[PDB]
Amino acid sequence: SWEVGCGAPVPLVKCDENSPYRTITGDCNNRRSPALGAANRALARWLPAEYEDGLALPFGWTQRKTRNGFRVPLAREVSNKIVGYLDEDGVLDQNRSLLFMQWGQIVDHDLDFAPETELGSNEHSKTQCEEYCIQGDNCFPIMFPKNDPKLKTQGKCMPFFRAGFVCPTPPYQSLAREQINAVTSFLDASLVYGSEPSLASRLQNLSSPLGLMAVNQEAWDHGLAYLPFNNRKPSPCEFINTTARVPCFLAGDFRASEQILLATAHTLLLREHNRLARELKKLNPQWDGEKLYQEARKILGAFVQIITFRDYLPIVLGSEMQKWIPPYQGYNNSVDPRISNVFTFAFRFGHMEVPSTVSRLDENYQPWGPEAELPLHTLFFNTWRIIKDGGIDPLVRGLLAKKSKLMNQDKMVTSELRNKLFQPTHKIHGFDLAAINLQRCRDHGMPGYNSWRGFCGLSQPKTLKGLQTVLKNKILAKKLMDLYKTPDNIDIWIGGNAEPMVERGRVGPLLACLLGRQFQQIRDGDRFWWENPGVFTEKQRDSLQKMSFSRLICDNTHITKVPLHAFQANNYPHDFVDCSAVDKLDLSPWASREN
Ligand code: HEM
Ligand SMILES: *[C@@H]1O[C@H](CO)[C@@H](O[C@@H]2O[C@H](CO)[C@@H](O[C@H]3O[C@H](CO)[C@@H](O)[C@H](O)[C@@H]3O)[C@H](O)[C@H]2NC(C)=O)[C@H](O)[C@H]1NC(C)=O
Numbered sequence: 267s268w269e270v271g272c273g274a275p276v277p278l279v280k281c282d283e284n285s286p287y288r289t290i291t292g293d294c295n296n297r298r299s300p301a302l303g304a305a306n307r308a309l310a311r312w313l314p315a316e317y318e319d320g321l322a323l324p325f326g327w328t329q330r331k332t333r334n335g336f337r338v339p340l341a342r343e344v345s346n347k348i349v350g351y352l353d354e355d356g357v358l359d360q361n362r363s364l365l366f367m368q369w370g371q372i373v374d375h376d377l378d379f380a381p382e383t384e385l386g387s388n389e390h391s392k393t394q395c396e397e398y399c400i401q402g403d404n405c406f407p408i409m410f411p412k413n414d415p416k417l418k419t420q421g422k423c424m425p426f427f428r429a430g431f432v433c434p435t436p437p438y439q440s441l442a443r444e445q446i447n448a449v450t451s452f453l454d455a456s457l458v459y460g461s462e463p464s465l466a467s468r469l470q471n472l473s474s475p476l477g478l479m480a481v482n483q484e485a486w487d488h489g490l491a492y493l494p495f496n497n498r499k500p501s502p503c504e505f506i507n508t509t510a511r512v513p514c515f516l517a518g519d520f521r522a523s524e525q526i527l528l529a530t531a532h533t534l535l536l537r538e539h540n541r542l543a544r545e546l547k548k549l550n551p552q553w554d555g556e557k558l559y560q561e562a563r564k565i566l567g568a569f570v571q572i573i574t575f576r577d578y579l580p581i582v583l584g585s586e587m588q589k590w591i592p593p594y595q596g597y598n599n600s601v602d603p604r605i606s607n608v609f610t611f612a613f614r615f616g617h618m619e620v621p622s623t624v625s626r627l628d629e630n631y632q633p634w635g636p637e638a639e640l641p642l643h644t645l646f647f648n649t650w651r652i653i654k655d656g657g658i659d660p661l662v663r664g665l666l667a668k669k670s671k672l673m674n675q676d677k678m679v680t681s682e683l684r685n686k687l688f689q690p691t692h693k694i695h696g697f698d699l700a701a702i703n704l705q706r707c708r709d710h711g712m713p714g715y716n717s718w719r720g721f722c723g724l725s726q727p728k729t730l731k732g733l734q735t736v737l738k739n740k741i742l743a744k745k746l747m748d749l750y751k752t753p754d755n756i757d758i759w760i761g762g763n764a765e766p767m768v769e770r771g772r773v774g775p776l777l778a779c780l781l782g783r784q785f786q787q788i789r790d791g792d793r794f795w796w797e798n799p800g801v802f803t804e805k806q807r808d809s810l811q812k813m814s815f816s817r818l819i820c821d822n823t824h825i826t827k828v829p830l831h832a833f834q835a836n837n838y839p840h841d842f843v844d845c846s847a848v849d850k851l852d853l854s855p856w857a858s859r860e861n
């Protein structure tokens with residue numbers, strides 16, 4: 267017995283079989299088991315879920331049931347006590363560009379999404395939850411602690427709605443609650459093309475057979491493209507400045523306009539597609555609307571994979587890279603490519619990497635104008651700033667010249683995300699990403715810190731002093747222990763991120779294991795991995811290794827000076843070489859001789 271069946275509410279179709287192109291939904295990747303890795307199926311479970319009532323109610327819900335004989339602390343008090351700080355000076359990561367943070371978020375959005383539950387295209391629950399903090403059904407309010415300033419000016423709580431879950435929607439039972447992943451598990455650039463057939467089509471330029479992706483028709487950027495605007499009303503990017511009224515952008519992933527430096531990357535990517543498609547059409551003039559589309563689309567997914575495995579992972583895992591992700595050896599059809607529920611929390615380490623301001627630089631990399639640097643919190647759902655204040659360039663240069671925040675145990679998440687986050691549904695810039703992350707662990711039913719330590723074959727501290735040694739911090743260890751009473755109860759997000767960093771890495775032992783594990787699996791489990799023999803020819807592969815994030819900027823914006831290594835901290839102008847000195851992608855191996 268297994269319950270095996272539940273293959274209900276999800277998009278299904280026919281396996282094109284032998285087709286050299288991925289499906290949009292990720293179906294048909296694994297032949298013997300066609301729905302592994304597909305958008306709209308449950309997050310995988312590496313360990314059984316731990317819910318309050320065994321089946322679905324999160325810990326903290328019933329105000330009188332303990333977890334291990336103890337009351338779990340309030341998300342927001344774990345925030346106020348451990349995650350907060352006030353001094354931004356000293357905080358910058360001395361050897362990582364602001365693009366280090368930015369790439370983690372693009373990869374993240376390619377791999378996982380647990381959407382909120384709706385049940386109201388009008389309903390008093392999307393307002394009985396915000397107005398009265400009444401816990402009930404999918405309303406699971408983040409209550410304020412006594413002494414939280416936010417009591418004085420905001421209300422009794424921050425509203426929060428539980429995540430969606432497989433099988434039906436309505437009030438549900440039987441099995442443990444399993445959250446949905448609305449995105450494909452494969453590094454396949456789903457964030458650019460969509461994970462659904464319908465959204466995928468809307469995105470395309472289908473008025474002409476050049477296989478181009480739709481581009482905004484209302485605004486231009488020095489004759490270079492922007493993403494289309496969204497039909498969607500109401501529109502939070504609009505609500506952010508009623509005078510400007512500039513809507514959010516339409517991309518293959520819905521979160522694209524969360525912040526300005528993420529809308530920027532989306533737009534460098536769309537631009538890469540269209541570029542690829544024109545170039546390809548020149549070489550092979552008989553190719554197709556569809557054929558141009560898929561071929562450019564296959565080059566792009568190779569891109570996201572190569573920069574990810576070659577440039578970004580080696581510097582997150584550090585010395586632990588070799589031990590979790592060994593060198594590639596071929597597609598293994600038994601490896602399970604599905605993104606695990608815990609990964610979507612482990613991958614939240616990047617939160618502690620976001621700094622507090624965003625800069626715009628002019629052509630010599632000098633402060634563009636008088637209001638160059640801005641508080642991150644005015645940039646949530648802000649598109650009016652790209653469109654009406656210089657477009658993309660001034661904002662890509664800041665990504666190469668400025669630095670990510672460094673995780674630090676006494677400074678974890680800047681207040682910009684911690685006190686001032688705009689959620690695209692509600693009205694204020696007053697949410698807290700840290701508390702939300704914690705409340706979210708609980709909703710998704712996560713095993714505690716020791717469970718995962720156990721999982722990764724690392725010691726499990728049971729006492730103050732043990733916790734002190736693992737964390738190599740006396741004080742942090744003391745706060746955690748005062749809020750939680752036992753390490754067994756420490757939520758994985760805050761435990762994972764509290765560990766000191768492995769050598770040359772930017773996460774700890776627990777985090778290197780869960781990430782390292784996930785990445786090995788999605789590479790080993792992907793029939794379309796770029797080095798998978800028979801997916802690109804040997805000469806195409808040789809061409810694809812020369813790609814770099816720098817080139818991408820050269821070919822797609824008017825920046826003429828860039829770093830060679832783009833994730834490392836780089837000083838202008840010593841570290842900046844001219845575009846000409848940067849290897850170009852040689853598209854000639856994609857030539858198709860008819861006779
Ligand atoms: C604003 C937000 C960011 C930048 C200023 C930001 C950044 C990151 C980075 C750098 C990540 C990894 C390197 C990363 C991972 C994931 N985040 Fe994201 N994030 C901002 C805002 C949010 C919000 C709001 C959420 C949702 C919180 C919730 O639980 O409802 C959020 C989530 C995630 C996430 C989980 C995705 C999923 O599977 O649902 C990451 C892996 N971020 N962020
Ligand atoms: C800032 O971080 C840089 C990130 O890698 C680092 O430079 C890199 O140092 C590592 C070893 O710590 C080396 O790893 C490389 O080894 C050779 C390149 O010579 C390659 O064959 C490997 O695949 C791998 O890339 C490199 O020597 C170097 N890598 C790069 C990309 O240049 C700097 O040392 C850091 N700066 C400081 C002072 O901390």
Ligand SMILES: *[C@@H]1O[C@H](CO)[C@@H](O[C@@H]2O[C@H](CO)[C@@H](O[C@H]3O[C@H](CO)[C@@H](O)[C@H](O)[C@@H]3O)[C@H](O)[C@H]2NC(C)=O)[C@H](O)[C@H]1NC(C)=O
Pocket residue numbers: 506507508509510650654
């Ligand atoms: C709402 O969005 C508006 C932009 O679409 C923005 O107003 C704009 O911003 C500044 C003023 O702060 C102006 O920039 C400069 O414009 C002219 C040059 O042509 C100068 O002479 C001015 O002195 C000024 O420095 C924009 O022109 C201005 N535009 C309009 C129509 O008001 C608002 O700032 C946004 N408000 C919020 C709350 O974010």
Ligand SMILES: *[C@@H]1O[C@H](CO)[C@@H](O[C@@H]2O[C@H](CO)[C@@H](O)[C@H](O)[C@H]2NC(C)=O)[C@H](O)[C@H]1NC(C)=O
Pocket residue numbers: 471472473474478479480481482483
């Ligand atoms: C779809 O593609 C066509 C072909 O590129 C676009 O039409 C061109 O767009 C630009 C900007 O308006 C102009 O040079 C011409 O108006 C068009 N040129 C040709 C060859 O006709 C069209 O804008 C694209 N549509 C969308 C929605 O992005």
Ligand SMILES: *[C@@H]1O[C@H](CO)[C@@H](O[C@@H]2O[C@H](CO)[C@@H](O)[C@H](O)[C@H]2NC(C)=O)[C@H](O)[C@H]1NC(C)=O
Pocket residue numbers: 598599600601
């Ligand atoms: C592909 O990976 C699978 C999945 O882990 C491997 O299957 C294992 O086979 C080994 C022998 O090498 C056994 O020790 C394990 O108990 C098996 N585990 C599972 C989960 O099946 C397998 O090693 C790999 N196959 C190839 C040819 O690389």
Ligand SMILES: [Ca+2]
Pocket residue numbers: 376377449450451452453454455456457
């Ligand atoms: Ca994907």
